[PDB]
Amino acid sequence: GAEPTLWAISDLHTGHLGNKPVAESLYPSSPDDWLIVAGDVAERTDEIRWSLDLLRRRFAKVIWVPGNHELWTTNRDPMQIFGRARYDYLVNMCDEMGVVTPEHPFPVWTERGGPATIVPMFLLYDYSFLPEGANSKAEGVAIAKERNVVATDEFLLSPEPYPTRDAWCHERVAATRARLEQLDWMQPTVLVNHFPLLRQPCDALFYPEFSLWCGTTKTADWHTRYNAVCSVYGHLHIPRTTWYDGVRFEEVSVGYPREWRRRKPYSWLRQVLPDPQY
Ligand SMILES: [Fe+3]
Ligand SMILES: [Mn+2]
């Protein structure tokens, strides 16, 4: 009576007043629990480090993937680093703390839930989730701008040295797909990515245009192609459990204080493995 569990959570946003207690209430159920943190830990590098240091001292293993907010460079950030350099800095930070990143070898869960390869991914988005009235990236962003639905990324998420964020996204997708092809085709995977791997969850957004900043069409079939037993994501701030083509998708976001105070959730940590039979 003390069997390990693989949990997940995302969108901690510890910099916002009121979400620091949430992060400070994250505890394991056994000394061998793993915790997936699926993006949007914080914006500033020191806040991200504080949160990840707090979590890695409680869980046996922490697997971190970046969200859009970790790649923001604000004026109040002690590290004025941008783009791929900022991502490499965050990866090196996590490595110095012992936190697993998308650049580390894929961890393998060998406890309850079967041998499952946990795949931490950094993919970003490529403006391919076009709104109904759009037929290109520029058209979609223009329609979103005229309706005042623009992501702050456009001004804070630098893609340097890449020219655009979709170029960075396509390179990330190419590399991650190359790594995914090298996996044993008969072993389940746990796909982790801040953004949803397919477009369907974005249909729950209050306004659809924002879907432009919510993923890429190049990963529409990865949950079935690579035999995923569970797909962990966040970003949308719509925490729930759904099923697509037999695969269980877990939106594990916490959100901003005024968002999750309207609800009363049963515990912050979402059980990824073993199957909770929900
Ligand atoms: Fe996000
Ligand atoms: Mn978020």
From Swiss-Prot:
Cofactor: Fe(3+); Mn(2+)
Annotated InterPro entries: Calcineurin-like_PHP_ApaH (IPR004843), Metallo-depent_PP-like (IPR029052), Pantetheine_PDE (IPR052963)
Keyword hit for Nucleotidyltransferase: no
Listed GO MF terms: [acyl-carrier-protein] phosphodiesterase activity; metal ion binding
Catalytic EC class: hydrolase
Binding locations of Fe cation: D40, N68, H194, H235
Protein keywords: Hydrolase, Iron, Manganese, Metal-binding
Catalytic reaction annotation: holo-[ACP] + H2O = apo-[ACP] + (R)-4'-phosphopantetheine + H(+)
EC id: 3.1.4.14
Description of the deletion phenotype: Deletion mutant is highly and selectively resistant to the amidino-urea compound 1-[(2,6-diethylphenyl)-3-N-ethylcarbamimodoyl]urea (compound 8918).
Positions contributing to Mn(2+) binding: D11, H13, D40, H237
Function: Catalyzes the hydrolysis of the phosphopantetheine group from substrate holo-carrier proteins.
Protein family according to the UniProt entry: Belongs to the metallophosphoesterase superfamily.
Protein's name according to its UniProt entry: [Acyl-carrier-protein] phosphodiesterase PptH
Gene: pptH
